Amino acid sequence: GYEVHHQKLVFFAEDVGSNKGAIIGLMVGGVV
Amino acid sequence: GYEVHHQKLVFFAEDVGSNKGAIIGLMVGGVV
Amino acid sequence: GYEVHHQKLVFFAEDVGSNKGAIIGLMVGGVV
Amino acid sequence: GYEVHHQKLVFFAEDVGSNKGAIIGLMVGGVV
Amino acid sequence: GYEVHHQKLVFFAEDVGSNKGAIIGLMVGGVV
Amino acid sequence: GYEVHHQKLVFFAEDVGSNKGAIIGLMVGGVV
Amino acid sequence: GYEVHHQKLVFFAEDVGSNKGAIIGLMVGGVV
Amino acid sequence: GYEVHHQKLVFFAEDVGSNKGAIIGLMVGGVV
Amino acid sequence: GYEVHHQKLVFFAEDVGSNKGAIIGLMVGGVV
Amino acid sequence: GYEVHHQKLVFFAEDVGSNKGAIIGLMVGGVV
Amino acid sequence: GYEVHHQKLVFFAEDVGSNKGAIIGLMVGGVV
Amino acid sequence: GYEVHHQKLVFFAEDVGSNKGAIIGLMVGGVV
């Protein structure tokens, strides 16, 4: 059978989140 | 069974001269 | 030209530069 | 021979809602 | 008993006024 | 004997009768 | 400046029709 | 001198019927 | 002549049926 | 002795059936 | 007579912390 | 002397013990 399933997640541009001070948090349960 | 197509989710914000203090919280709780 | 259930979400923001610390609270659980 | 489809969602804002200090609470769980 | 169902939803907002503090509260969890 | 076809929807909104401070509160769960 | 008193507000929601996809997408910003 | 107060809000959703999958997306950005 | 500010926001939800996956996507910025 | 600045936000959800399906993505911005 | 600033935010869900399954993401974008 | 400022943020859930894991992510770039 034929099946397609994919996605894309991009979070807006803004005042870059450098280190010390600003911050970016990514949480992904466990790993493959 | 059922067939589906991929999707896309994109947010974009323009800021004059990146810098100090931005904060992003992304949680992807899921399994392949 | 075969098409199935598809979607797309776009959030675009263009404007000078509000104050210190923008903030993204986003959740992408997921399920089989 | 007939296929189904869904809609497209676009939230576009100029002026109101600039970078730095803005707050987006967006929930994108998943699909049943 | 299947038919094509698609559309486009675009929301454009823009208007000089005062102060900042803007807030987006959107729930977009899958579809029925 | 109702048929479904494509369509387009665009909405443009200016100044919110009252100070600034905007607030987008929408629930986009499935469709009727 | 005017004196403001408190009050009590309660809401109860049930679903008839059939089955129930519950969905609460709300924005509770604030008012001057 | 002077004194101020706010109101109280209570929300309750529950009703015998079927399925589940609940989704709550909320924005509560404090306002001065 | 002292500043006074209190509040009370309550969101309660429950429903049998089947499966689970509940989803909370919430943004609670802050205050100045 | 005297009232001051306070708040109160309560979220309560009950879900059985399958293994715990829950996905919480919450952003608590904050202020300097 | 010193000003006091406090808040109370609480999320109650009927589900402990099982194995690969429940998922919680919390981000506090701010500086002491 | 120095004004008082602190808060209370709690994420809690109750049900069946179960085993080792569940998945929680806390992001807070800051230093005393």
UniProtKB/Swiss-Prot annotation, chains A, B, C, D, E, F, G, H, I, J, K, L:
Binding site for Cu(2+) 2: Y2, H5, H6
Mutation effect (A13G): In AD1; Flemish mutation; increases the solubility of processed amyloid-beta peptides and increases the stability of peptide oligomers
Effect recorded for G25V: Reduced protein oxidation. No hippocampal neuron toxicity
Glycosylation sites: Y2
Binding site for Zn(2+) 2: Y2, H5, H6
Feature type site, description Cleavage: K8, L9, F11, F12
Entry's localization field: Cell surface
UniProt effect for mutating E14Q: In CAA-APP; Dutch type
Impact upon substituting V16C: Causes formation of an artifactual disulfide bond with PSEN1
Residues annotated as site: Implicated in free radical propagation: G25
Ranges where the record places region Interaction with PSEN1: 16-32
Site entry: Susceptible to oxidation: M27
Self-association and partners: Interacts with S100A9.
Descriptive protein name: Amyloid-beta protein 40
Residues of the full protein shown: 680 to 711 of 770
